[PDB]
Amino acid sequence: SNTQAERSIIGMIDMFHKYTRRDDKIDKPSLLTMMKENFPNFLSACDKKGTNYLADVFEKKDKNEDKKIDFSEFLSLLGDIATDYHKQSHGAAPCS
Amino acid sequence: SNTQAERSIIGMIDMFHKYTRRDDKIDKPSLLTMMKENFPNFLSACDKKGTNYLADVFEKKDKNEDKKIDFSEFLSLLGDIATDYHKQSHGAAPCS
Numbered sequence: 440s441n442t443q444a445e446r447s448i449i450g451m452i453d454m455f456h457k458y459t460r461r462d463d464k465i466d467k468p469s470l471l472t473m474m475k476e477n478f479p480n481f482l483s484a485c486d487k488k489g490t491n492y493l494a495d496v497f498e499k500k501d502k503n504e505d506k507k508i509d510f511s512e513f514l515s516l517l518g519d520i521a522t523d524y525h526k527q528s529h530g531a532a533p534c535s
Numbered sequence: 536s537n538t539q540a541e542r543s544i545i546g547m548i549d550m551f552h553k554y555t556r557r558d559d560k561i562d563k564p565s566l567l568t569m570m571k572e573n574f575p576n577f578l579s580a581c582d583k584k585g586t587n588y589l590a591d592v593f594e595k596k597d598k599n600e601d602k603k604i605d606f607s608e609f610l611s612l613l614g615d616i617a618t619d620y621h622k623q624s625h626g627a628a629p630c631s
């Protein structure tokens with residue numbers, strides 16, 4: 440009975456919780472793993488452009504520099520990923 | 536070949552584009568419609584709590600007050616929705 444958009448959003452929460460530790464936050468190695476497992480085609484596109492997304496994603500998204508990715512920071516990362524697919528649909532090359 | 540998380544994100548871009556006008560932004564009536572069509576169970580939960588989400592969502596999310604919802608503002612709205620499901624998974628009542 441949930442819609443597709445609702446299922447999609449709930450899905451990101453459960454994805455998140457696949458990788459958190461007991462503090463409900465994601466550490467650097469867990470985040471790179473989350474990315475390889477859940478966005479391998481996104482990453483591949485970047486690589487083909489000469490961009491290694493995982494070299495700096497943790498440092499870019501760990502805005503408060505506590506060496507963890509919290510939920511708000513996780514959402515911001517999903518935002519960056521969404522934004523690239525949005526740009527592409529408007530014709531930009533991927534990972535622009 | 537896209538993963539579920541990748542399909543989910545692409546899905547939000549295409550959802551967005553179901554409701555935009557030629558300026559690639561969503562107007563107030565279109566946004567309320569997007570919400571009733573894609574988050575009816577989210578909204579229902581709110582209503583049961585005495586909260587009508589659509590009374591103020593446009594005004595809360597139209598951060599630059601140009602009377603449109605742009606993509607960045609749309610993402611922020613998805614963020615609010617995600618955040619409520621996250622809180623719930625940690626035991627909060629919905630639409631808290």
Ligand SMILES: [Ca+2]
Nearest residue numbers: 501503505507
């Ligand atoms: Ca952090």
Ligand SMILES: [Ca+2]
Nearest residue numbers: 597599601603
């Ligand atoms: Ca606006």
Ligand SMILES: [Zn+2]
Nearest residue numbers: 456463621625
């Ligand atoms: Zn959590």
Ligand SMILES: [Zn+2]
Nearest residue numbers: 525529552559
């Ligand atoms: Zn667009």
